[PDB]
Structure 1
Amino acid sequence: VTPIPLPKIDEPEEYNTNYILFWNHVGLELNRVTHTVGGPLTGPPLSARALGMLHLAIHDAYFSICPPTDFTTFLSPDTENAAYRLPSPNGANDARQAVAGAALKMLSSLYMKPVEQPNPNPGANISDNAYAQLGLVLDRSVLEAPGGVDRESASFMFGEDVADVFFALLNDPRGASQEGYHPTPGRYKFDDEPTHPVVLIPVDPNNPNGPKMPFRQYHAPFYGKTTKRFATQSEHFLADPPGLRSNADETAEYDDAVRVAIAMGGAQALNSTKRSPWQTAQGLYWAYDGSNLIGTPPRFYNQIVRRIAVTYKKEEDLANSEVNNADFARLFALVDVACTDAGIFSWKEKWEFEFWAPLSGVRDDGRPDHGDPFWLTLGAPATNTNDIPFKPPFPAYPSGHATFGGAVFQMVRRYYNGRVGTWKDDEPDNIAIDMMISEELNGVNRDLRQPYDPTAPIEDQPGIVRTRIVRHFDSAWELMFENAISRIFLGVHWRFDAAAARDILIPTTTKDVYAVDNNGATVFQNVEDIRYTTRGTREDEEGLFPIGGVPLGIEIADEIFNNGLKPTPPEIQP
């Protein structure tokens, strides 16, 4: 089959001399390829799950052979429960081959053709070409693996066994099912996106030029409530969003939110848009909304973590260093598991409240002096395609980006505290990074004038090229913040979807109404001064809960970390 020409990644090639990073890289490649061909594990919550499973398998394969001191393996070989019983090395002592077997097995189980009946219903939507392209990635990775892959080694086979365990235990085949779900129209209620009310998909995925059919998508409406958690030791909840349930009386907040939404997230040329060119860059930088050759947010968060990992490694040798191998194996397991659970809980709350997107909220507002029936947002970029911007097919509260980021970057902060610098676990850190380039703005990817051609490299395809922006960040606190507000700039999330408006915006004398600059643009607090302290109430539960995705993610990361990466007790599983 014709292999898809993938654009070059902006990262020192030395990174892949380390087999832990190499396998992480292979996971990231499958991520972007599956989103280009429409293969399995697409979308934000599930794509994060794939990475969590991959790194959990790698983590235990490595630490079984090279036992850790300050912590232990996720699963143990002495568990009476067969489902949580980790296999034993029994002679195997080649960590490199162990990791290879775990990674290869997991990724293959995740991305290959479900010959075991699973193809029906679940996989009945993915074309043969999709699987073929994914297979190519897998096949060549074996050949590019640093140190090679010896499929006949005992260590390799051990790794495979480890993968089988984690796969059977955590795989959620029907995770993204939407069968039986239908929106419940009304104020504040999620429903089909006005600029993309329906989509025409081929009746037969193997004949994309053949007859089409109308399709309305709702992304994983049942996943969050039915899926198995990874390492969280409890259920997490967010305060009711402004306008709903116990907070239905927070009208000043909601009204100002509508106001900030129009000014900060509208289309580039609308007279009501007050967003600056720089803020537009900040919005697109963190997108990764499932585009061709790009993939989803988890892929970007891992690209960032890869840089942090190498920038702050203990030993200079990337290839032959167990200190580095252990460090990376541990870090990525912590990070990707937190990302996985962040997805579960953000999706759980998303479909719990079913809060509507700013596009619908502004248009359907109804009040002549508050709404704008013809508003358009900067929207989620439709990169490497000729389609227009959209709003991802799922409820708004809370922001998945914000939750993912909160978890990933809080985990990084907990892990490096006292090593890169010293800070209170709830205050700004000093984990700075340089030369960080997003594939949304790399001088290569673009907005095409014609349909994407998968047989030709992106450079030979006409379109407006995205300006190359090289960033530097002073801390993971900043990363966490900007990643969250970027969605406000795109106009796909309300301010409260990120965090409590009181914690991120500059207040005025009027309660719930925040400050704007000379030209009407919203003013944010300085990153160093931001503290996610503002909590709210829930109708169905007593107490105060976090508002927005960031606080939720931070909470999930602290929990997992504090428990040293321990499985969710099967008793509290759904």
Structure 2
Amino acid sequence: SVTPIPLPKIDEPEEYNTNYILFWNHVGLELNRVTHTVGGPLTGPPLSARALGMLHLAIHDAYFSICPPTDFTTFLSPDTENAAYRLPSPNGANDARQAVAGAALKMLSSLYMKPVEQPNPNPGANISDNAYAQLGLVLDRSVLEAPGGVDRESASFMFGEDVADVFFALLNDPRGASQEGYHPTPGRYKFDDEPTHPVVLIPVDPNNPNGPKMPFRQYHAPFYGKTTKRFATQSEHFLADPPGLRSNADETAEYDDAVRVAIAMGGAQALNSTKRSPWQTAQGLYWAYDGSNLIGTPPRFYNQIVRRIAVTYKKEEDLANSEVNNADFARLFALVDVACTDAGIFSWKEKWEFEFWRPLSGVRDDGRPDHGDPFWLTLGAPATNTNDIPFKPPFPAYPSGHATFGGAVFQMVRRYYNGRVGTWKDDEPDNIAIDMMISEELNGVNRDLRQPYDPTAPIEDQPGIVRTRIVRHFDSAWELMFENAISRIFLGVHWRFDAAAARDILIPTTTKDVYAVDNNGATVFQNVEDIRYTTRGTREDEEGLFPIGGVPLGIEIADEIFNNGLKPTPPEIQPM
């Protein structure tokens, strides 16, 4: 019926998919890259992080209900009075593999299916039939590839579906990405449509892509962070005001030097003002995953990394028949994807609260003859596998989503493995090393096309400039967290403070708020082993000191969720 989209191969040992927990995670990752190629539901970083959080929460409770855990307990309980938080009982269901298949298939089905349930009122509607159809093939195909098979008649399978229904009804946010009613408010420091993509022409009818097109200005999920239900956070999280705003509107020396670093470190490859090296250029793209064709969003890459970590530090050698491994993975992925979801929530809530402008507009519209550059261009977020030019993500700058996602994901890995892989203070560098780690942005396969992407052909048969294959090894999760964060400074899409306080990451000079630069004028960073996220800042509306940028925010969301043992956010503190 539908011509299936030819997907490129994943750089991962085939062995990983013999484990059913990893297998379903993988299916969730395939839907992520496919939905970003076809323009289906749950696109964008915050909502694609939530889809994975939901999938793993459903998997967690189906598994641990059938194979009860020792310390922790299920996220939801069977004896809870509140029906919405009431986990179905097994009553004879004893097959964990089928329970997981059931929870996984039901959740993903609900998330990516054609919303024939009437309530498809533009919540995020403008998805073609082909998009739904392409995603349906991924789902149908997975049933057949699942290790050990799928038995829909099984009791255990039906129990899993029950679990999925509960989590879906409780956590689904259909209109989370609604833009309705939002319009930028220009002025210094304020977010507005980026100047290289001021408007995009989208078809009037998605089903008819070669017909009429209309003007469209995109503002990604302006109301999400404020209104959506949180997952496992036990409090609301806040960041210090960014330099130039509110209580910090007097941090002009910081702001000025930030403009300077932005130019030298994040400009286009060929500009005379760009001081970034070839290796730093590789660090910027490696961590991209900016919603591209065949690639998807950042949560996808972070999960690709955690899969490697999981298998590398597994307790038992058998990936296929080991409950010790199955429980370790079901647990890790739940903690990690839940932290990722909530990090997406709070980074987006802070992004739209401050509405801080991206560096491209900040540098072009600075207004001062000796500070700005009305013609500056950034290396930009890469439009991989398209013949489009780089772009600036369609949402405010402060704090960085990449830094926040990364601070949460990797701090969660660190807490989980402390004492197991090595020993460290929870706030100092770990020992979690990985190697042979390849990013799809730099794999010798993906590329920058010279003509529009052809969905009926494998990218290998499409002319374009092929991205160099770079194989990395990292020494710790502290390095991952740091590099993932500064990568955005090299792409030129984030200010230094969107990642973390400049003091904690840059080498100081005798001049306050001004940092060290080498011979060729490039910014020099602190050694990863020495980095400590301690600099706090003030807020105009609240008393106390608060973290600065995304990494410290992600770190705090992860510690809270872990310290509380993966427990639902009290309903009394969810948005009104």
Report the CA distance between 1:122 and its aligned residue.
1.9
**8 Å Cα contact 1:114-1:123 kept in structure 2:** no
Deviations 1:87-122 (A, max 9, x none): 000000000000000000000000000010122322
**8 Å Cα contact 2:124-2:178 kept in structure 1:** no
* Aligned mates of 2:227, 2:172 — CA distance in 1: 12
Tell me what 1:409 maps to. 410
**8 Å Cα contact 2:434-2:474 kept in structure 1:** yes
* Aligned mates of 1:8, 1:124 — CA distance in 2: 30
TM-score by length of 2: 0.99
Report the CA distance between 1:4 and its aligned residue.
0.2
Tell me what 1:484 maps to. 485
Distance 1:123 1:398, change over 3 A: closer
Report the CA distance between 1:123 and its aligned residue.
4.4
TM-score by length of 1: 1.00
Tell me what 2:11 maps to. 10
* Aligned mates of 1:270, 1:527 — CA distance in 2: 29
SS at match of 1:471: strand
Deviations 1:175-210 (A, max 9, x none): 000000000000000000000000000000000000
* Aligned mates of 2:546, 2:313 — CA distance in 1: 34
Report the CA distance between 1:467 and its aligned residue.
0.0
% identity of equivalent residues: 100
**8 Å Cα contact 2:351-2:399 kept in structure 1:** yes
**8 Å Cα contact 1:50-1:110 kept in structure 2:** yes
**8 Å Cα contact 1:17-1:146 kept in structure 2:** yes
**8 Å Cα contact 1:19-1:146 kept in structure 2:** yes
Q: How does 1:359-438 map to 2 (within 5 A)?
A: 359-438=360-439
* Aligned mates of 2:349, 2:122 — CA distance in 1: 23
SS at match of 1:529: coil
Tell me what 1:542 maps to. 543
Deviations 1:36-92 (A, max 9, x none): 000000000000000000000000000000000010000000010000000000000
Tell me what 2:278 maps to. 277
* Aligned mates of 1:86, 1:285 — CA distance in 2: 40
Deviations 1:478-502 (A, max 9, x none): 0000000000000000000000000
SS at match of 1:443: coil
**8 Å Cα contact 2:347-2:550 kept in structure 1:** yes
**8 Å Cα contact 2:123-2:176 kept in structure 1:** no
Tell me what 1:250 maps to. 251
Report the CA distance between 1:156 and its aligned residue.
0.2
Deviations 1:415-464 (A, max 9, x none): 00000000000000010000000000000000000000000000000000
* Aligned mates of 2:523, 2:118 — CA distance in 1: 53
**8 Å Cα contact 2:500-2:549 kept in structure 1:** yes
* Aligned mates of 2:485, 2:162 — CA distance in 1: 39
* Aligned mates of 2:519, 2:393 — CA distance in 1: 32
SS at match of 1:545: coil
* Aligned mates of 2:24, 2:86 — CA distance in 1: 24
SS at match of 1:407: helix
Tell me what 1:339 maps to. 340
* Aligned mates of 1:280, 1:45 — CA distance in 2: 26
**8 Å Cα contact 1:280-1:490 kept in structure 2:** yes
* Aligned mates of 1:71, 1:116 — CA distance in 2: 36
**In the comparison of the two structures, how many residue pairs are matched?**
574
* Aligned mates of 1:169, 1:291 — CA distance in 2: 30
Tell me what 2:46 maps to. 45
**8 Å Cα contact 1:198-1:214 kept in structure 2:** yes
**8 Å Cα contact 1:414-1:425 kept in structure 2:** yes
Tell me what 2:185 maps to. 184
Report the CA distance between 1:168 and its aligned residue.
0.1
Report the CA distance between 1:522 and its aligned residue.
0.2
Report the CA distance between 1:544 and its aligned residue.
0.1
**8 Å Cα contact 1:405-1:550 kept in structure 2:** yes
Tell me what 2:495 maps to. 494
Q: Which runs of 5+ in 2 are unaligned?
A: none
* Aligned mates of 1:13, 1:337 — CA distance in 2: 26
Report the CA distance between 1:15 and its aligned residue.
0.1
* Aligned mates of 2:478, 2:239 — CA distance in 1: 21
Structure 1 segments of 4+ aligned residues over 4 angstroms from their partners: none
Report the CA distance between 1:124 and its aligned residue.
2.6
* Aligned mates of 1:534, 1:66 — CA distance in 2: 44
* Aligned mates of 1:28, 1:38 — CA distance in 2: 15
Deviations 1:115-152 (A, max 9, x none): 10122322430000000000000000000000000000
**8 Å Cα contact 2:34-2:135 kept in structure 1:** yes
* Aligned mates of 2:131, 2:563 — CA distance in 1: 40
* Aligned mates of 1:491, 1:13 — CA distance in 2: 36
**8 Å Cα contact 1:62-1:95 kept in structure 2:** yes
**8 Å Cα contact 2:281-2:490 kept in structure 1:** yes
* Aligned mates of 1:197, 1:552 — CA distance in 2: 30
**8 Å Cα contact 2:124-2:177 kept in structure 1:** no
SS at match of 2:343: helix
* Aligned mates of 2:513, 2:134 — CA distance in 1: 51
